[PDB]
Design a protein around this ligand. Structure first.
Ligand SMILES: [Cu+2]
Length: 236
């Protein structure tokens, strides 16, 4: 059913739970988020809170770690949606995020259905960060730019890889690059969809809840797949 069970589990609005256990340079922390995704429109709304007090890193640095199965894949690209096709058993998402002239994150997440909730459970380990870098020094603006996520099928596994560079606005007007390497593997055993080269086009809006005492991030996200044109002449 991997050609169809995918889209079907994501019609309408699906609730989301995110759980992050982080350790950056020995500083442990935890984030919980909840909200909902509308895959048909490629729309996510979530609120994350740091449950261990203050967040030891800027919230923007955690955005990409904190559910690409909610992408809007156009109809002519539906057979390239690996993320949904691995559902409900889900997929493992692993990243290496290298911050230029600073430390690196390594992340391992399981993204899967638990009941009617889409869950993203993550472990994050950061090392080699500078005590007064842009990351541990909290020098990054509280905003987020739009990016493409370039996806390719695994050469030999039934998974995908992705590569992209996040651009973090630094509060002195400069830019902090966060190079992303990404690997996704199905948790289950059945077939999945393996995509042609394509990308996820992603846009994010960060805000704050004015009635929120805890360290927190409110996030609205839009994500749609693009870059494959086969099957489209009739639309013009
Ligand atoms: Cu199938």
């Amino acid at each position: 059913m991997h050609n169809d069970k995918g889209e079907e589990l994501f019609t309408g609005v699906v609730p989301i739970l995110v759980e992050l256990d982080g350790d950056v340079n020995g500083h442990k922390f935890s984030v919980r988020g909840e909200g909902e995704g509308d895959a048909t429109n490629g729309k996510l709304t979530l609120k994350f809170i740091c449950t261990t007090g203050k967040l030891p890193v800027p919230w923007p640095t955690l955005v990409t770690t904190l559910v690409q199965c909610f992408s809007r894949y156009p109809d002519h690209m539906k057979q390239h949606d690996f993320f949904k096709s691995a559902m409900p058993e889900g997929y493992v998402q692993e990243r290496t995020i290298s911050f230029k002239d600073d430390g690196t994150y390594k992340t391992r997440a399981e993204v899967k259905f638990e009941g009617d909730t889409l869950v993203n459970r993550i472990e994050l380990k950061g090392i080699d960060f500078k005590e007064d870098g842009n990351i541990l020094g909290h020098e990054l603006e509280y905003n987020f730019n739009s990016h493409n996520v370039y996806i390719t099928a695994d050469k030999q596994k039934n998974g995908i890889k992705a590569n992209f560079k996040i651009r973090h606005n630094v509060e002195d007007g400069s830019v902090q690059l966060a190079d992303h390497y990404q690997q996704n593997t199905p948790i289950g055993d059945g077939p999945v969809l393996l995509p042609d080269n394509h990308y996820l086009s992603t846009q994010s809006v960060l805000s704050k809840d004015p009635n929120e005492k805890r360290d927190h991030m409110v996030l609205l996200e839009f994500v749609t797949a693009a870059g494959i044109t086969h099957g489209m002449d009739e639309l013009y």
